[PDB]
Amino acid sequence: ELPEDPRWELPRDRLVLGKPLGEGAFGQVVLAEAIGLDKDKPNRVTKVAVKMLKSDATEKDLSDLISEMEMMKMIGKHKNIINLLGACTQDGPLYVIVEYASKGNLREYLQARRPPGLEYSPSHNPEEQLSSKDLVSCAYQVARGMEYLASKKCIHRDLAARNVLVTEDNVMKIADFGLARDHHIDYYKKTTNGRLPVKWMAPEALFDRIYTHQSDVWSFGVLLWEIFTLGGSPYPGVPVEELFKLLKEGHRMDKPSNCTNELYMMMRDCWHAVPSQRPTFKQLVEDLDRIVALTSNQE
Numbered sequence: 001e002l003p004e005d006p007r008w009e010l011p012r013d014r015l016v017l018g019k020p021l022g023e024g025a026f027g028q029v030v031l032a033e034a035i036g037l038d039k040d041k042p043n044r045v046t047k048v049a050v051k052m053l054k055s056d057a058t059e060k061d062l063s064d065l066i067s068e069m070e071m072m073k074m075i076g077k078h079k080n081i082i083n084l085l086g087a088c089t090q091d092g093p094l095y096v097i098v099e100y101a102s103k104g105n106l107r108e109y110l111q112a113r114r115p116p117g118l119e120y121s122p123s124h125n126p127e128e129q130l131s132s133k134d135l136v137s138c139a140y141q142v143a144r145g146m147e148y149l150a151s152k153k154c155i156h157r158d159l160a161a162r163n164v165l166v167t168e169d170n171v172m173k174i175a176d177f178g179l180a181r182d183h184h185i186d187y188y189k190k191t192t193n194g195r196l197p198v199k200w201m202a203p204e205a206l207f208d209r210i211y212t213h214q215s216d217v218w219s220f221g222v223l224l225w226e227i228f229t230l231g232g233s234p235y236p237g238v239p240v241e242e243l244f245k246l247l248k249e250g251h252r253m254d255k256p257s258n259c260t261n262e263l264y265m266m267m268r269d270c271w272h273a274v275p276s277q278r279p280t281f282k283q284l285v286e287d288l289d290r291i292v293a294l295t296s297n298q299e
């Protein structure tokens with residue numbers, strides 16, 4: 001039996017379970033409506049994402065979901081992270097209730113707003129479109145959320161655009177920052193979408209399994225490269241073995257088109273071979289804040 005925590009407990013009948021959002025082994029995510037989540041009124045419905053376990057789920061899968069919930073409790077609230085909203089822990093399956101981000105992950109969000117398909121792409125007529133000031137703003141918000149997490153002593157370890165979520169009002173929220181330990185990462189495994197996670201990893205994290213905030217800043221570099229190529233895939237066609245060798249030689253990704261030199265030097269700085277020489281999230285937040293204000297939105 002799980003102990004109740006009246007800070008977070010929502011009665012079960014206050015939650016109407018809706019359509020799935022996400023799969024699978026790592027815990028199913030469904031859309032729901034919570035009645036009367038907040039103090040008052042109890043008469044208002046909030047759309048939430050609810051995390052749960054699947055059918056043939058183990059005790060270890062249960063243990064991880066709890067740990068991720070408790071971790072969110074300790075970390076506290078920020079505008080640029082997926083916040084914990086509630087939990088149903090008693091008399092049934094465990095539900096962890098978290099903020100809903102209705103535009104999905106940043107990679108998807110970036111890809112969907114790419115300019116229309118030409119003869120040589122071809123009918124990708126998006127309904128929506130991001131200026132240069134919008135793109136630097138995405139980076140500012142992710143850096144803000146990361147700075148907040150680092151100040152709470154949290155190391156993400158898998159920062160990437162797939163783990164940044166986008167709300168209906170276009171606010172970036174970092175997801176998956178409370179996920180459990182896991183000495184057992186296999187470099188060969190892919191994402192659903194076909195990409196290798198080793199490609200956001202700092203060399204020291206990759207080779208010596210040293211995970212720090214500095215290593216997260218390495219991942220934010222690649223995230224910056226993802227925002228500025230509008231969801232471009234890092235090192236496409238490069239297998240893990242060849243990636244090892246590009247890292248060893250000090251290879252660094254090319255500068256995206258429609259990226260200022262200043263922003264590309266930011267990427268490069270984040271990718272400094274020496275971890276102590278990278279900027280901090282605090283420095284990146286100051287820098288981006290300045291650049292945003294100077295970045296024209298007219299294009």
Ligand SMILES: CN1CCN(c2ccc(NC(=O)c3n[nH]c4ccccc34)cc2)CC1
Pocket residue numbers: 021022029049082098099100101102103104105165175
């Ligand atoms: C056509 N697309 C429309 C957008 N769509 C979509 C929209 C929203 C979400 N959101 C989520 O899955 C989500 N929102 N908050 C979360 C907290 C933890 C884990 C997941 C989440 C996922 C996918 C994907 C399909």
